[PDB]
Design a protein around this ligand. Sequence first.
Ligand SMILES: *[C@H]1O[C@H](CO)[C@@H](O[C@H]2O[C@H](CO)[C@@H](O[C@@H]3O[C@H](CO[C@@H]4O[C@H](CO)[C@@H](O)[C@H](O[C@@H]5O[C@H](CO)[C@@H](O)[C@H](O)[C@@H]5O)[C@@H]4O)[C@@H](O)[C@H](O[C@H]4O[C@H](CO)[C@@H](O)[C@H](O)[C@@H]4O[C@H]4O[C@H](CO)[C@@H](O)[C@H](O)[C@@H]4O)[C@@H]3O)[C@H](O)[C@H]2NC(C)=O)[C@H](O)[C@H]1NC(C)=O
Ligand SMILES: *[C@H]1O[C@H](CO)[C@@H](O[C@@H]2O[C@H](CO)[C@@H](O)[C@H](O)[C@H]2NC(C)=O)[C@H](O)[C@H]1NC(C)=O
Ligand SMILES: *[C@@H]1O[C@H](CO)[C@@H](O)[C@H](O)[C@H]1NC(C)=O
Length: 537
Amino acid sequence: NQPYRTGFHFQPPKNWMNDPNGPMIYKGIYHLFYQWNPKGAVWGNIVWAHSTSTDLINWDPHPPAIFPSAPFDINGCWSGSATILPNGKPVILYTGIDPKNQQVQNIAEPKNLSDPYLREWKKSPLNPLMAPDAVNGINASSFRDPTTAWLGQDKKWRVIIGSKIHRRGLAITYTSKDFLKWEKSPEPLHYDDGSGMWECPDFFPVTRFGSNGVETSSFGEPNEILKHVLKISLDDTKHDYYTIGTYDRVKDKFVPDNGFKMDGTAPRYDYGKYYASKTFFDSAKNRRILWGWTNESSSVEDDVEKGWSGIQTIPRKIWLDRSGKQLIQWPVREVERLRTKQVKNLRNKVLKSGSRLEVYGVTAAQADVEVLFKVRDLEKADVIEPSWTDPQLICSKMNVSVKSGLGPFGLMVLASKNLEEYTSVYFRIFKARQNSNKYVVLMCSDQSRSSLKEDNDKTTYGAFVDINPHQPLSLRALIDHSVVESFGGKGRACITSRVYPKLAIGKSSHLFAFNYGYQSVDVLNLNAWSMNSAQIS
Ligand SMILES: *[C@H]1O[C@H](CO)[C@@H](O[C@H]2O[C@H](CO)[C@@H](O[C@@H]3O[C@H](CO[C@@H]4O[C@H](CO)[C@@H](O)[C@H](O[C@@H]5O[C@H](CO)[C@@H](O)[C@H](O)[C@@H]5O)[C@@H]4O)[C@@H](O)[C@H](O[C@H]4O[C@H](CO)[C@@H](O)[C@H](O)[C@@H]4O[C@H]4O[C@H](CO)[C@@H](O)[C@H](O)[C@@H]4O)[C@@H]3O)[C@H](O)[C@H]2NC(C)=O)[C@H](O)[C@H]1NC(C)=O
Ligand SMILES: *[C@H]1O[C@H](CO)[C@@H](O[C@@H]2O[C@H](CO)[C@@H](O)[C@H](O)[C@H]2NC(C)=O)[C@H](O)[C@H]1NC(C)=O
Ligand SMILES: *[C@@H]1O[C@H](CO)[C@@H](O)[C@H](O)[C@H]1NC(C)=O
């Protein structure tokens, strides 16, 4: 009936869903809002749907919180963010479409602050608070997605909205003392020529050393160094990127660290299907949670047919890695509460060149797997080409059928009995240079053989993994019928993909560990956890 609906990923009972909106925590209750189409499996009639949770895994339904009802949002209620004011009151800033189809920024607040589920929201008659006009010269067609705001040292609030002027991406900053009267700043928080429109911006602090999250307005301390992350969704490429840097509060400008540029060359949170991501500070457990939208890789016809489209990945905790050059991600630990009591284990299994090992006793279509690979004699690894810089193209030109010294070796998920269908998540090791001791670790998510149906988008994804092959390579994959979330090197590389196998469905799906490389690899350990379905909206 619905072979591709997920058992533990967030998604509405039906219809189209896109950007996650106003993620927040209030009175111990997690809130998730999201762009939803009340009457279609394609984008349209967009409103802010609403759901609440106490563990970020199980979600309870609620009526749409924000939907067209006034001139300032008559043609649509687009994405936005929630900010928790000092007095503990949560407010929402969202982009609305006015009568002339112009994008404007409106504020919304709860009607009953005593309601922990914040079911009803009211919209200020002062809206819009920020709008495109002849005075500011902002592009009325490219001015959207207000972020969560942060309080400045001068007690004035700051907020940025995604925009652009021609080909220059912009993070337009506004300031306010009362959160009502907002003044456009002369200079943007940041920009970049050639990137194109900047959507779903995000700006937050991260601790230099540690995995704990940091309140969005927190200032740097002489003994507490804080870095700042600027994240934007590039409309031109459909990918989410981020850069690590410092915050010049004097000029009110973001300053990327050396080797960082806010554009298509910056790092991504996820190298597969992932967009419009947004974080929020979970003051309940001192962590920053990242929400990300993953659209369908199936045809629109299939979408209309199944009656829905779009899911959110499993929320994940994010923090700065020790090197300080990238962020690390890991699904919230609460998802582990879905793992079956009895886990399937496999230790010290030597995978010989061209061999594969099947993992029995687990619902291969809805599980969580974590493997530890131990390579043998790295000197045997091929020397990567000097010019190769695109991980995706390497995975594309050197697919699973192409052998090498070390790899392809990893996992075959959502696979059929006789591998007629399968999604391959693996590693491939290259030697930095001839006789060198430095190695390049590549992570691939190949869906070229994921389904017999050809209308599905089987694009292959790839990403480099900042880990040393001399130590066991870590790999994790969350399998959920039509979505696979792969984590390499304990979250140093993430790849989300959507597949729709015609055979590898439900009970007929299988899980395999494999090694098609010339040099055999050793599977130190492997844990497969059947995942129980969650109660979601
Ligand atoms: C959610 O919605 C969809 C996901 O469903 C997503 O939209 C895009 O997803 C992919 C990007 O991740 C796009 O994938 C590309 O597909 C091309 C292949 O298409 C197939 O073959 C024909 C096209 O050549 C055609 O029969 C069909 O596709 C149609 O093509 C026309 C183009 O005229 C297009 O307008 C239509 O929309 C159709 O897509 C077939 O399905 C393919 O060329 C692309 O692959 C190249 O690039 C990838 C990296 O992105 C790389 O891995 C490959 O190796 C390949 O590389 C080429 O260039 C190299 C040079 O560097 C060469 O060396 C090499 O030989 C190759 O020539 C790519 O896979 C997909 O088209 C697109 N889908 C649609 C309909 O928009 C959204 O992004 C997503 N939304 C959000 C917000 O997340
Ligand atoms: C801002 O408004 C829209 C934002 O999309 C821009 O219109 C696009 O312009 C490009 C050229 O760079 C065309 O290829 C697209 O077809 C246009 N699409 C739309 C929305 O019509 C517009 O150019 C921008 N204006 C300025 C000066 O920033
Ligand atoms: C406000 O919300 C609380 C909690 O849901 C509820 O007990 C109370 O009756 C509500 N007050 C009204 C009538 O708005």
